[PDB]
Amino acid sequence: LDSGSTKEFFRRSKIAVFDKMWTYMRSAEPSVFVRTTAEGVARVRKSKG
Amino acid sequence: LEGNFKGLCKQIDHFPEDADYEADTAEYFLRAVRASSIFPILSVILLFM
């Protein structure tokens, strides 16, 4: 979620298991930041797994 | 039959939109065997032969 503290955790993450995911999330096409929390939910409901 | 558009026939196909199985090797066979019904066709050909 954009401009949230869950964004800030993977930003400030120091551990190597946590660091490799934020390089994956920054290099993700298309961009996975959503406007509201419920619209990110509706992306999963239409995601197909 | 006994619908609104009675006596109207169309083709049927295996379920193509959000099937929710990622081609399971037991499931993808049994779906393909039913859609291309080779064993009812094989009963036709061996009756003919």
The residue of chain A with its CA nearest to that of B22 is A49
Contacts of A47 in chain B (CB under 8 A): none
In the structure encoding, which two tokens stand for residue B44, read together?
């036709």
Query: For the CA atoms of A39, A41, A43, A47, what is the dihedral angle to 10 degrees?
Result: -170
Q: What's the farthest any 2 CA atoms get from each other in chain A?
A: 33
Cα–Cα nearest to A21, from A29, A32, A10: A10
Q: Which residue has the tokens 């939109």?
A: B17
Query: For the CA atoms of A7, A9, A10, A15, what is the dihedral angle to 10 degrees?
Result: 180
Gap between the Cα atoms of B15 and B10, Å rounded:
15
Give the resolution to one decimal, in Å: 4.0
Gap between the Cα atoms of A19 and A12, Å rounded:
9
Sign of CA dihedral A23, A29, A35, A40: negative
Q: How was this structure determined?
A: cryo-EM
Cα–Cα nearest to A49, from B17, B22, B31: B22
Gap between the Cα atoms of A49 and B22, Å rounded:
9
Gap between the Cα atoms of B5 and A40, Å rounded:
40
* CB distance A45 to A38 below 8 Å: no
* Count of other CB atoms within 10 angstroms of residue B19: 13
The answer to whether residue A45 neighbours chain B at the CB level (below 8 Å) is no
